[PDB]
Every structure is written in structure tokens, then in C-alpha cells.
Swiss-Prot record:
Plays a role in the mitochondrial apoptotic process. Upon arrival of cell death signals, promotes mitochondrial outer membrane (MOM) permeabilization by oligomerizing to form pores within the MOM. This releases apoptogenic factors into the cytosol, including cytochrome c, promoting the activation of caspase 9 which in turn processes and activates the effector caspases. Zn(2+) binds at D130, H134. Belongs to the Bcl-2 family. A motif (BH3) lies at residues 44-58. The chain holds residues 20 to 186 of 211 of the full protein. Changing H134A: Strongly reduced zinc binding and homodimerization. The lineage of its organism: Eukaryota, Metazoa, Chordata, Craniata, Vertebrata. It comes from Homo sapiens. The gene is BAK1. GO terms for molecular function: BH domain binding; channel activity; heat shock protein binding; identical protein binding; metal ion binding; porin activity; protein heterodimerization activity; protein homodimerization activity. The keyword Ubl conjugation does not apply. One of its GO terms (cellular component) is BAK complex. Intact BH3 motif is required by BIK, BID, BAK, BAD and BAX for their pro-apoptotic activity and for their interaction with anti-apoptotic members of the Bcl-2 family. This is Bcl-2 homologous antagonist/killer. It is a single-pass membrane protein. Homodimer. Formation of the homodimer is zinc-dependent. Forms heterodimers with BCL2 and BCL2L1 isoform Bcl-X(L). Forms heterooligomers with BAX. Interacts with BCL2A1. Interacts with RTL10/BOP. Interacts with VDAC1. Interacts with GIMAP3/IAN4 and GIMAP5/IAN5. Keywords: Acetylation, Apoptosis, Host-virus interaction, Membrane, Metal-binding, Mitochondrion, Mitochondrion outer membrane, Transmembrane, Transmembrane helix, Zinc.
Length: 156
């Protein structure tokens, strides 16, 4: 329902913040220990970092190259995020692309901090939370069992 969709969207901050910490293992805001690491959503983000490292290296390389060609700053990051994220889902939603979105967010926050020296992980967290809510992705996850479904995506 609308409620379960909203619930997934409310859980995304914790998932993404855990995902980033485990994916990152120089950018200090990614080294900060995650809040509530052993919470269910913390564990979801941990698992998404594993499966992304296993199966999403092609997307990772793509986003690294895109951001090298772009050279986003805090001032234009939102415009690039929106167009790239939107294009990622134009042919539909699947778990591969949900993981890819998180990875794009990680790379965007990393690039912006490393070049402009202003914190940006919190801003990208909001970009990702809002994007999933506004582009039927939280709804799609809710229809498949909520974020806990990401504890059983296929990694061993």
C-alpha cells in the first residue's frame, strides 16, 4: 500500500548509510562508523555492499568513468544525479538497478568530497531517499517484501 511504500522509503537512509560504510572499505564521512550496524536495515545495507561488489562491477566502472568525465561539484551534482538515476530505470526496475543506484550514490558522494572538500554524503543520502520514493522504486521494493528481501538476493 501507500504505507508499505512509505515505510521502505523511511528505511532507505539507514540502508544507504550502512551500504556506504561497507562499500568504502580518502573520504572521512565514509569511514564514520554506521549508526546501529546490527539493526535489520543496517544488515540489509551490509548485504547490498557484498552483492554489489560481486555482481555490479560493470556499473561501478561505468559510474567512475561518468564522474571522471563529469567532474561534479556540490552545485551541479543534483542535476547529474537526477538524469543519470532516471536513465538507469527507464527500461524498468530490478534489483540489479537498485544496487547500481546505491553504488552511483556512493561514487557521487565520494567524488564531490574529494575534489571540493565539502561534505556531501548526507546530501546524496537525501538524493537517494527521495529518488526511490518519487520514482516507484520504494513501491517496487515494498511489493517484493520490503528491504528485508535484500537479505536474500543471491550472494552466498
Amino acid at each position: 500500500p501507500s504505507a508499505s511504500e512509505e515505510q521502505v522509503a523511511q528505511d532507505t537512509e539507514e540502508v544507504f548509510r550502512s551500504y556506504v560504510f561497507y562499500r568504502h572499505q580518502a573520504d572521512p564521512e565514509m569511514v564514520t562508523l554506521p549508526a546501529q550496524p546490527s539493526s535489520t536495515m543496517g544488515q540489509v545495507g551490509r548485504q547490498l555492499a557484498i552483492i554489489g561488489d560481486d555482481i555490479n562491477r560493470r556499473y561501478d566502472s561505468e559510474f567512475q568513468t561518468m564522474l571522471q568525465h563529469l567532474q561534479p561539484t556540490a552545485e551541479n551534482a543534483y542535476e547529474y544525479f537526477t538524469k543519470i538515476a532516471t536513465s538507469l530505470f527507464e527500461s524498468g526496475i530490478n534489483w540489479r538497478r537498485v544496487v547500481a543506484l546505491l553504488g552511483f550514490g556512493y561514487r557521487l558522494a565520494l567524488h564531490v568530497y574529494q575534489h571540493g572538500l565539502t561534505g556531501f554524503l548526507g546530501q546524496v543520502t537525501r538524493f537517494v531517499v527521495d529518488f526511490m520514493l518519487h520514482h516507484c522504486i520504494a513501491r517496487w521494493i515494498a511489493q517484493r517484501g520490503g528491504w528485508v528481501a535484500a537479505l536474500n538476493l543471491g550472494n552466498g
